[PDB]
Design a protein around this nucleic acid. Structure first.
Ligand code: K
Ligand code: K
Ligand code: K
Ligand code: K
Ligand code: K
Ligand code: K
Ligand code: K
Ligand code: K
Ligand code: K
Ligand code: K
Ligand code: K
Ligand code: K
Ligand code: K
Ligand code: K
Ligand code: K
Ligand code: K
Ligand code: K
Ligand code: K
Ligand code: K
Ligand code: K
Ligand code: K
Ligand code: K
Ligand code: K
Ligand code: K
Ligand code: K
Ligand code: K
Ligand code: K
Ligand code: K
Ligand code: K
Ligand code: K
Ligand code: K
Ligand code: K
Ligand code: K
Ligand code: K
Ligand code: K
Ligand code: K
Ligand code: K
Ligand code: K
Ligand code: K
Ligand code: K
Ligand code: K
Ligand code: K
Ligand code: K
Ligand code: K
Ligand code: K
Ligand code: K
Ligand code: MG
Ligand code: MG
Ligand code: MG
Ligand code: MG
Ligand code: MG
Ligand code: MG
Ligand code: MG
Ligand code: MG
Ligand code: MG
Ligand code: MG
Ligand code: MG
Ligand code: MG
Ligand code: MG
Ligand code: MG
Ligand code: MG
Ligand code: MG
Ligand code: MG
Ligand code: MG
Ligand code: MG
Ligand code: MG
Ligand code: MG
Ligand code: MG
Ligand code: MG
Ligand code: MG
Ligand code: MG
Ligand code: MG
Ligand code: MG
Ligand code: MG
Ligand code: MG
Ligand code: MG
Ligand code: MG
Ligand code: MG
Ligand code: MG
Ligand code: MG
Ligand code: MG
Ligand code: MG
Ligand code: MG
Ligand code: MG
Ligand code: MG
Ligand code: MG
Ligand code: MG
Ligand code: MG
Ligand code: MG
Ligand code: MG
Ligand code: MG
Ligand code: MG
Ligand code: MG
Ligand code: MG
Ligand code: MG
Ligand code: MG
Ligand code: MG
Ligand code: MG
Ligand code: MG
Ligand code: MG
Ligand code: MG
Ligand code: MG
Ligand code: MG
Ligand code: MG
Ligand code: MG
Ligand code: MG
Ligand code: MG
Ligand code: MG
Ligand code: MG
Ligand code: MG
Ligand code: MG
Ligand code: MG
Ligand code: MG
Ligand code: MG
Ligand code: MG
Ligand code: MG
Ligand code: MG
Ligand code: MG
Ligand code: MG
Ligand code: MG
Ligand code: MG
Ligand code: MG
Ligand code: MG
Ligand code: MG
Ligand code: MG
Ligand code: MG
Ligand code: MG
Ligand code: MG
Ligand code: MG
Ligand code: MG
Ligand code: MG
Ligand code: MG
Ligand code: MG
Ligand code: MG
Ligand code: MG
Ligand code: MG
Ligand code: MG
Ligand code: MG
Ligand code: MG
Ligand code: MG
Ligand code: MG
Ligand code: MG
Ligand code: MG
Ligand code: MG
Ligand code: MG
Ligand code: MG
Ligand code: MG
Ligand code: MG
Ligand code: MG
Ligand code: MG
Ligand code: MG
Ligand code: MG
Ligand code: MG
Ligand code: MG
Ligand code: MG
Ligand code: MG
Ligand code: MG
Ligand code: MG
Ligand code: MG
Ligand code: MG
Ligand code: MG
Ligand code: MG
Ligand code: MG
Ligand code: MG
Ligand code: MG
Ligand code: MG
Ligand code: MG
Ligand code: MG
Ligand code: MG
Ligand code: MG
Ligand code: MG
Ligand code: MG
Ligand code: MG
Ligand code: MG
Ligand code: MG
Ligand code: MG
Ligand code: MG
Ligand code: MG
Ligand code: MG
Ligand code: MG
Ligand code: MG
Ligand code: MG
Ligand code: MG
Ligand code: MG
Ligand code: MG
Ligand code: MG
Ligand code: MG
Ligand code: MG
Ligand code: MG
Ligand code: MG
Ligand code: MG
Lengths: 48, 272
RNA sequence: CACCUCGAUGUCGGCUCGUCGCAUCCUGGGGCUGAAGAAGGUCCCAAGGGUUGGGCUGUUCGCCCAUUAAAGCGGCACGCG
RNA sequence: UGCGAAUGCCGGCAUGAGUAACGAUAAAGAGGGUGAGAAUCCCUCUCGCCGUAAGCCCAAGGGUUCCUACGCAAUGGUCGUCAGCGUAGGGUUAGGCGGGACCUAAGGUGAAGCCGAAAGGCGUAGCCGAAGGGCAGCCGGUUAAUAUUCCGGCCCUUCCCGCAGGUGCGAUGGGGGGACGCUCUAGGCUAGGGGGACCGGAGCCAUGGACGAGCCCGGCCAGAAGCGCAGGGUGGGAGGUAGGCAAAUCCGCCUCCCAACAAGCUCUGCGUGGUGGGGAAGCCCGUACGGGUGACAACCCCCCGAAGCCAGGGAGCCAAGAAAAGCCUCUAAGCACAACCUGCGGGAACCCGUACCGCAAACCGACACAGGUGGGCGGGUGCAAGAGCACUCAGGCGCGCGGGAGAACCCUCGCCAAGGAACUCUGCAAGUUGGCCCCGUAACUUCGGGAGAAGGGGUGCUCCCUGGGGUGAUGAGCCCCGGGGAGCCGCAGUGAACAGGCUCUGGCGACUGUUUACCAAAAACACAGCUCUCUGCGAACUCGUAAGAGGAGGUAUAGGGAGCGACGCUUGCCCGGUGCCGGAAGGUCAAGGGGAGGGGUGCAAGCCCCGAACCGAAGCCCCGGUGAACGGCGGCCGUAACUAUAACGGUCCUAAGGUAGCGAAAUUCCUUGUCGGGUAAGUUCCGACCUGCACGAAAAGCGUAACGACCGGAGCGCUGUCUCGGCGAGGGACCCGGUGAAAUUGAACUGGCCGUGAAGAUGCGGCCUACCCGUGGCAGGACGAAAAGACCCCGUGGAGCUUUACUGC
RNA sequence: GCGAGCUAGCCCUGGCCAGGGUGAAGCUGGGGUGAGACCCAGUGGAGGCCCGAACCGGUGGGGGAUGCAAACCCCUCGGAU
RNA sequence: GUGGUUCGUGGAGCCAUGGGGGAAUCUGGGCGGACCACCGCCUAAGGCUAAGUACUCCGGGUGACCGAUAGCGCACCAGUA
RNA sequence: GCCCGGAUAGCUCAGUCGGUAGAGCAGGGGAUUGAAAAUCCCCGUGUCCUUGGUUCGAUUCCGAGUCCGGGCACCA
RNA sequence: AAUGCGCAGAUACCGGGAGGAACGCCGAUGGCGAAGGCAGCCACCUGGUCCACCCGUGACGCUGAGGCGCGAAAGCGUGGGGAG
């Protein structure tokens, strides 16, 4: 049937994107933690 | 006058639509229409603050004149009477002689062509707005300002009307469509007559769908829910109220009075 | 009563499939009779085989309808998911 | 710091086992080629399948999967020489297509401003934001792979700078416009389609016949100006002018005029059109595929015809149907040796996307997964129509294991003698019925329905006659709707396929709707409608600490809350308790006020403690009201001239003791109540009675036409449902070749009976049976597997829910 | 702190619903009357109207149950301005 | 009305402060645990101030610390697949 | 089968601190009436259900028993 | 008599206001209408009737099954109103 992943490149960057994170202090802290852990990508990989 | 239907389908038995005879113009005054944001009952957080609201025909706001003194003594000819999807009443389009066109809420009796005018001058005739203090006692009157220059706010629904009962200094004694007796300041404007489209109260929607067209979504009884949702929810089968009848927010809903007692306006009220 | 089983022994009835017991419903053998005959009554031997189709109710049971030599009772985790 | 257990952790390797599977029952066969190797790759022929798709084009998503060359370890459910796989190389070209140097929508953001302990929340303008608005490219050819992108032909747009000619020019400001619903719809066209006796074309004459106006193939596409043919939009002048937040000559308003179902201006569509392209079958080409020829190809006539175009067309209706820019006009500063407008020239015209998949082996589903995925095209013939069904074009496919075999059993399917629900919880299932035309059609009804009620008759082909339409012309042709009469053949003419079984009677719910994604679709929710209640507008109410927002740019014919749930006839009594409402008195009552009077220290002046009256709100008490507010709505004894029963009486209690109507009911325990009906037989069903365990009037009472994948009872029709089974088909199951799992598993050399044993033993006792090992089958046992039982209890375990439990907010 | 790319509601903007039936009002004509109501025709084309694809569903049954599938398949069924 | 302190209203002071009231400048004020008296200590409502103290992303030195299931999650292109 | 309530005049019922117990109706006797009612005057019988026990004394207090009324019989 | 109302300030009295219904005297055994029925006062629209005159038409008449219209009170529907 219709599964839970309905990909939408705008959705992805609008929701979990770098500019998305940087507005909320909750999301800036997401980057903080992700960098401190040394993730290769802080934000989900997206393609305009 | 009001249209009925033959029962060629169920819900057409009892369906009833208004009589659009007094309607003269179909498309509205383009220079006098705004778009209205449809809330679906949601506030500026994305939350519902009025339940069971949404859907319903797209509507275009007719910007209408509730302050009539900004054209004192300038008369105008009643050009049209048109449908307004945003109120119970019908609106009248009037062409002022100086070329401005405005929407007035159309009183009963008013028909196309007559002169109309606002101001302490004005003749006491249907359509004319005047400060209350110059409107003779016992005159039925609508679209009443509640405080001077704050705009008309009283009796503007179909077939509503206030009536002047007496005078007291700067105030005058009004009987409102709700039977309440209130003093209103004499300087408050009010166009004379009653609202009209007076048969609005007889239209019988007919089917559930017709409620949807007015943007009224279904409304579910507390008794139909569970205790998490409503004070009346739960039980086994059906179940009586089992307590003083209450709203979803737990306050009593039979008789319990809610006007703030300490309200300053209490000084100017005298009835029910 | 609370002995095995609550780190699980699926619970009524039906259907299918049976198998055994006998305290025998029928058929077979018999004693007594308040047994003329015919039909019974009751007890004895006997478990080889047989032991119907329908209405009602989920029903087991039971009651009816129509037959029958007869429309036996039980046990097998109230046999068998 | 010593491991055997912890349904312990990690890893490795077993068992089941060469076992189940190899992923749609659309289907294959042969020949040639290639290669170490071929059922599986290439090619030919034959066969099958899709064809409102299983073909083609967009969008999203994916991201090199595209093309070529070389490969086969692995991935591919087998094989592989093949690949969506490995290696390498190549490949995606735009002023006009999509998007950005344009607009605004919800929403987001957000100068000003408002709010919040901090983080932050709000917020007019502005900005951002699109599958909406605006805006200039069509068609062929070319490549292994791109093309509206390169090329060719023809045609446009914008910017800049010049000329030339015009005009008071000129905004982010004023106005017009853009600009709008649903349903139905006229005319004229276009796409698209069919026919042709005509134009063109290789060829063919088979097998009995046919050299014929024979068969087969094709007969077009893009196209500026100008011309037509349709349609859409729009009145022309003069005065007055206080409105459009300055100013307008513009708009609006007023008054004059001329004009008026038009015209004339425009604007779009369609046709023609310079020119430019295409151009079959077949046949020969060697391509996996394209080329050559057919050819100087022909390129016409008729008919059908949109849902598309003219389009802002028209009519009706109510629920009353975005915005902003481009665009036109108007004026303001400013400037008028500027500027703008109109043509014509030359120049200038950037960023990104463009491969390939794209109903799927490339997207979402862990898989080359029988699932899921939006827009457009979607031909032909027939069937009443149609996107329906059957076949079929273009195109695409045979589903990435095969070969046999011909058991049980399984699945999907076909038929069945006699019977026809006897099956069973239940006609579950399957059957029957089925399209169109015509005849006909009841109770009841809210007059619409019920109705497709029910039940019938017809349906093919041939010849003769014959009436209308549309198109041509009033005429022929081509279509479309028919009507009459003769006759032909079969078991059968909606000859295949698609296509209701019907009646009667109850319960519930008025109705179409809605719901437990994934065991409940319902009598549950909703619903129009009825009542109660709140709420005078900075409304009540809701969200938020707040600002603020929704309510509502609404105003008592309105909005919120509660119940009841079309409609019909109705909705009785009880206000003692609880709740809500009203009570300017009284009692009580907290802080506060007030201080009689006591007290501690000081030598005192003092300082400092308590503190009685009395004045003190809401609340409670108290007095009333209130039932579509929470709710409630009796007992015992007696009595009538046969009995029986009790209209009548007595008396106890209560706030008052259940009215109409209904009643063994979705309520009736006793119960299969009793009577009637249906049946041969009826714990069901229907009608009744009333003894109502334990109905009863808006948690509504009793009815009600119509509706229902709801639930019950009856019957007809018809059946493999059954007596009661049989045969057959295919897909599996079986054998062979290839690949090859799973839960489970203390170890096993794992029989029966009667006992015993923790009380149901392969494992102990006695006895009895019994050569070793497999294969196809069945399921009685291994208290078989699966899940640390969901029932039950326990734990001073946990959670959801309630309230006159406690305590708080 | 992260989630409405599934799902529920609402908001903005677009799109879809083959083909049949039924035949409300209104018109227009005729009758009717003092005038009407009303009646009959024809036209008209309304409806949470009817049949039925797409599309949205998920009624009954069978299959499936280490599945093709962690909700599928077949027949059947509901809605379809 | 509260917080802090050992101080949970307690005989409850001291320091802090949301609300109300509201002074004085040395013969002035605060404190020594209700309060008063005595006797003492201090000088509120302005500010700055090294060191001794805390920590370990990093550098070094050590180890009756590990030795690839240990030791950091990572000894290996790991916050990777 | 398991709990609670009651039993008093002929009927329906109050009642008690442990001593001689009343109400209403019915019934009886008188009155009024032509005669019945209705009205008026006057009149209780009670072994306070059975049985045991506490008392000086029990309808009263207690324990059982008959009888009646009410509530219960759940997961299963 | 009691229910009821009343020191929470009633009745009785004055003043202000709201509201609905019905129209005293005139008024009569009177008038009008076909009946049902009609009563303050003003206006508009409108029916019948009588009289005077003897002018017009010229039997155009009377009755009237059905049909159609009106029809006190009570009652019913949708709304409004609601003092007695
Ligand atoms: K509701
Ligand atoms: K409930
Ligand atoms: K157990
Ligand atoms: K036997
Ligand atoms: K047996
Ligand atoms: K089972
Ligand atoms: K282990
Ligand atoms: K093995
Ligand atoms: K390979
Ligand atoms: K596979
Ligand atoms: K756009
Ligand atoms: K402008
Ligand atoms: K042209
Ligand atoms: K391309
Ligand atoms: K097909
Ligand atoms: K075989
Ligand atoms: K049977
Ligand atoms: K059908
Ligand atoms: K039925
Ligand atoms: K009903
Ligand atoms: K349903
Ligand atoms: K529901
Ligand atoms: K608003
Ligand atoms: K009460
Ligand atoms: K009360
Ligand atoms: K009361
Ligand atoms: K005090
Ligand atoms: K009964
Ligand atoms: K009952
Ligand atoms: K009978
Ligand atoms: K009978
Ligand atoms: K249903
Ligand atoms: K077994
Ligand atoms: K406890
Ligand atoms: K229609
Ligand atoms: K303290
Ligand atoms: K201090
Ligand atoms: K001190
Ligand atoms: K000190
Ligand atoms: K410092
Ligand atoms: K290792
Ligand atoms: K590790
Ligand atoms: K009593
Ligand atoms: K007595
Ligand atoms: K008559
Ligand atoms: K009343
Ligand atoms: Mg997932
Ligand atoms: Mg890196
Ligand atoms: Mg506008
Ligand atoms: Mg519920
Ligand atoms: Mg919730
Ligand atoms: Mg609650
Ligand atoms: Mg409740
Ligand atoms: Mg529940
Ligand atoms: Mg209940
Ligand atoms: Mg109110
Ligand atoms: Mg035990
Ligand atoms: Mg076990
Ligand atoms: Mg036996
Ligand atoms: Mg024997
Ligand atoms: Mg036997
Ligand atoms: Mg039965
Ligand atoms: Mg029998
Ligand atoms: Mg037993
Ligand atoms: Mg037993
Ligand atoms: Mg059993
Ligand atoms: Mg081990
Ligand atoms: Mg390893
Ligand atoms: Mg095996
Ligand atoms: Mg096998
Ligand atoms: Mg196999
Ligand atoms: Mg396959
Ligand atoms: Mg071959
Ligand atoms: Mg082959
Ligand atoms: Mg394909
Ligand atoms: Mg992928
Ligand atoms: Mg390839
Ligand atoms: Mg190759
Ligand atoms: Mg392989
Ligand atoms: Mg390929
Ligand atoms: Mg490759
Ligand atoms: Mg630029
Ligand atoms: Mg913000
Ligand atoms: Mg913008
Ligand atoms: Mg666009
Ligand atoms: Mg091309
Ligand atoms: Mg390509
Ligand atoms: Mg091209
Ligand atoms: Mg100008
Ligand atoms: Mg064309
Ligand atoms: Mg054509
Ligand atoms: Mg055609
Ligand atoms: Mg030739
Ligand atoms: Mg021949
Ligand atoms: Mg020839
Ligand atoms: Mg020839
Ligand atoms: Mg063409
Ligand atoms: Mg003009
Ligand atoms: Mg101006
Ligand atoms: Mg024109
Ligand atoms: Mg050539
Ligand atoms: Mg139009
Ligand atoms: Mg702008
Ligand atoms: Mg040019
Ligand atoms: Mg492409
Ligand atoms: Mg593919
Ligand atoms: Mg493809
Ligand atoms: Mg493709
Ligand atoms: Mg598609
Ligand atoms: Mg494919
Ligand atoms: Mg494809
Ligand atoms: Mg495959
Ligand atoms: Mg697939
Ligand atoms: Mg996939
Ligand atoms: Mg097709
Ligand atoms: Mg056709
Ligand atoms: Mg057809
Ligand atoms: Mg098809
Ligand atoms: Mg083909
Ligand atoms: Mg397939
Ligand atoms: Mg048969
Ligand atoms: Mg037969
Ligand atoms: Mg028959
Ligand atoms: Mg039967
Ligand atoms: Mg069936
Ligand atoms: Mg069928
Ligand atoms: Mg009938
Ligand atoms: Mg009819
Ligand atoms: Mg009919
Ligand atoms: Mg034939
Ligand atoms: Mg059929
Ligand atoms: Mg149907
Ligand atoms: Mg029943
Ligand atoms: Mg329903
Ligand atoms: Mg329907
Ligand atoms: Mg469900
Ligand atoms: Mg659903
Ligand atoms: Mg189900
Ligand atoms: Mg279901
Ligand atoms: Mg607001
Ligand atoms: Mg209800
Ligand atoms: Mg004091
Ligand atoms: Mg008080
Ligand atoms: Mg009270
Ligand atoms: Mg009631
Ligand atoms: Mg009830
Ligand atoms: Mg009720
Ligand atoms: Mg109901
Ligand atoms: Mg009923
Ligand atoms: Mg009914
Ligand atoms: Mg339905
Ligand atoms: Mg069978
Ligand atoms: Mg067979
Ligand atoms: Mg095998
Ligand atoms: Mg052995
Ligand atoms: Mg044993
Ligand atoms: Mg041994
Ligand atoms: Mg031993
Ligand atoms: Mg042994
Ligand atoms: Mg043994
Ligand atoms: Mg075996
Ligand atoms: Mg074996
Ligand atoms: Mg088996
Ligand atoms: Mg087990
Ligand atoms: Mg468990
Ligand atoms: Mg357990
Ligand atoms: Mg459970
Ligand atoms: Mg506990
Ligand atoms: Mg606990
Ligand atoms: Mg979503
Ligand atoms: Mg959503
Ligand atoms: Mg419909
Ligand atoms: Mg349908
Ligand atoms: Mg479509
Ligand atoms: Mg869907
Ligand atoms: Mg299903
Ligand atoms: Mg369907
Ligand atoms: Mg503290
Ligand atoms: Mg001290
Ligand atoms: Mg070492
Ligand atoms: Mg490691
Ligand atoms: Mg490692
Ligand atoms: Mg007694
Ligand atoms: Mg005694
Ligand atoms: Mg008159
Ligand atoms: Mg004369
Ligand atoms: Mg009447
Ligand atoms: Mg009346
Ligand atoms: Mg009435
Ligand atoms: Mg009534
Ligand atoms: Mg009323």
């Amino acid at each position: 049937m219709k599964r839970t992943w309905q990909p939408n490149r705008r959705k992805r960057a609008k929701t979990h994107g770098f500019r998305a994170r940087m507005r909320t202090p909750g999301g800036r802290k997401v980057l903080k933690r992700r960098r401190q852990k040394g993730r290769w990508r802080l934000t989900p990989a997206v393609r305009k | 006058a009001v249209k009925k239907f033959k029962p060629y389908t169920p819900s057409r038995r009892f369906m009833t639509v208004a009589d659009f005879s007094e309607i003269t113009k179909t498309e509205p005054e383009k220079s006098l229409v705004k778009p209205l944001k449809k809330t679906g009952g949601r506030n500026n957080q994305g939350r519902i603050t009025v339940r069971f609201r949404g859907g319903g025909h797209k509507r275009l706001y007719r910007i209408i004149d509730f302050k009539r003194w900004d054209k004192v003594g300038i008369p105008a000819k009643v050009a049209a009477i048109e449908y307004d999807p945003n109120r119970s009443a019908r609106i009248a389009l009037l062409h002022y002689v100086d070329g401005e066109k405005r929407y007035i809420i159309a009183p009963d009796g008013l028909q196309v062509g007559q002169q109309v005018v606002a101001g302490p001058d004005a003749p006491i005739q249907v359509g004319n707005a005047l400060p209350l203090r110059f409107i003779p006692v016992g005159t039925v009157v609508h679209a009443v300002e509640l405080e001077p220059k704050k705009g008309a706010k009283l009796a503007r629904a179909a077939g509503t009307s206030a009536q002047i009962q007496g005078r007291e200094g700067d105030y005058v004694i009004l009987r409102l469509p709700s039977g309440e007796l209130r003093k209103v300041h004499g300087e408050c404007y009010a166009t004379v007559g009653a609202v009209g489209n007076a048969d609005h109260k007889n239209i019988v929607l007919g089917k559930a769908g017709r409620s949807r067209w007015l943007g009224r979504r279904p409304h579910v009884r507390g008794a139909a829910m569970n205790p998490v949702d409503h004070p009346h929810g739960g039980g086994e089968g059906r179940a009586p109220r089992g307590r003083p009848p209450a709203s979803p927010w737990g306050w009593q809903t039979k008789g319990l009075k809610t006007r703030k007692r300490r309200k300053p306006s209490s000084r100017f009220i005298i009835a029910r």
